[PDB]
């Protein structure tokens, strides 16, 4: 019934740094992914209370969303780009796991993921 605490976006014990690849990922999020027409269901944690999804956090034990990722980038939470890419993969996979093929939300995730992977394939360095 209740929502879990959302994923942390800062941790005083976790080392932080800025890298040009992490800056590129933030640029991709802000310029391209955040304002995509299909972005809005991914811009914040799934609110199982509002949506009355008592099973969501029984099925999804590693939640992730683009609002969390964006804040992590803005707070320099990550040590490397791979951590951030893994968070994106987790977000997309969670959507595929909870929902079912043919759902419009799955089509939205697939389109966002296709665009994200295009941007990954253009990562600098």
């Amino acid at each position: 019934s209740m929502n879990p605490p959302p994923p942390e976006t800062s941790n005083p014990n976790k080392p932080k740094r800025q890298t040009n690849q992490l800056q590129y990922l933030l640029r991709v999020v802000l310029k391209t992914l955040w304002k995509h027409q299909f972005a809005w269901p991914f811009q914040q944690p799934v609110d199982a209370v509002k949506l009355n999804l008592p099973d969501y956090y029984k099925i999804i034990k590693t939640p992730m969303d683009m609002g969390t990722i964006k804040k992590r980038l803005e707070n320099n939470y990550y040590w490397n780009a791979q951590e951030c890419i893994q968070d994106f993969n987790t977000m997309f996979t969670n959507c595929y796991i909870y929902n079912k093929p043919g759902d419009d939300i799955v089509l939205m995730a697939e389109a966002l993921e296709k665009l994200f992977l295009q941007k990954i394939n253009e990562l600098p360095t």
């Binding site: 269901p41 799934v46 949506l51 009355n52 999804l53 929902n99 939300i105």
Partner: peptide, 8 residues
């Protein structure tokens, strides 16, 4: 599905 269409 999550009922997102019902939100609005």
């Amino acid at each position: 599905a999550k009922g997102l269409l019902l939100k609005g």
